[PDB]
Amino acid sequence: DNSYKMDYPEMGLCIIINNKNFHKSTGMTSRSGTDVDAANLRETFRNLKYEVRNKNDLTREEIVELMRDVSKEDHSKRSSFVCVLLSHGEEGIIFGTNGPVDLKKITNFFRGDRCRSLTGKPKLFIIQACRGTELDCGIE
Amino acid sequence: KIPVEADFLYAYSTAPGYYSWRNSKDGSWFIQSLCAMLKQYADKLEFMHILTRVNRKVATEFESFSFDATFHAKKQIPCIVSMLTKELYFY
């Protein structure tokens, strides 16, 4: 009761969205290094026994649709659900390869009232993306 | 009943409103640190203490290197946002 029940038959899904190459019309550079990340994520969560599904260079349409379909699977026999987004972004916003998507819309597919097979189970979202343009200069 | 927003955990790579940093050959600071820390501790530690160790690693060990002085010598602190209701162990 103080710990999430984790000994379901499956750990759960680990969706990795690895956006490396954007269409020039967005004015965003390529994300050199993200393949190292997407691969470090794969091996690390495979040792934790997740069902990693890697996906590459999705448009904002593809991402909303991927998330929608995954939230409609039967997660009844699954402990938790992980999702990593690797991309550009601003505050609240993650980028498909052709434009921004509000984060609230990716996650709302997995609300407690919208995906019952995951009600009461932990839903994790790792986000590697910028959240604005301020710079931390630090202090020694 | 539970809130429909409960049991989400958001692990942001950086403070609200700030840049996030990626190395062009090694990967992003956050994902290198998260994977190292999970490899080291996912069988001894609760999830928040692992992510707190990710914060220390990023915060104290990385400093941005750039030929553009505007973007050089910059730091990053990651951002854990927890609406979780229980503790989390990977075993």
């Binding site: 050199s32 991309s87 | 990626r22």
Partner: peptide, 5 residues
């Protein structure tokens, strides 16, 4: 070298 996202 290090870059912004």
């Amino acid at each position: 070298i290090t870059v912004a996202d």
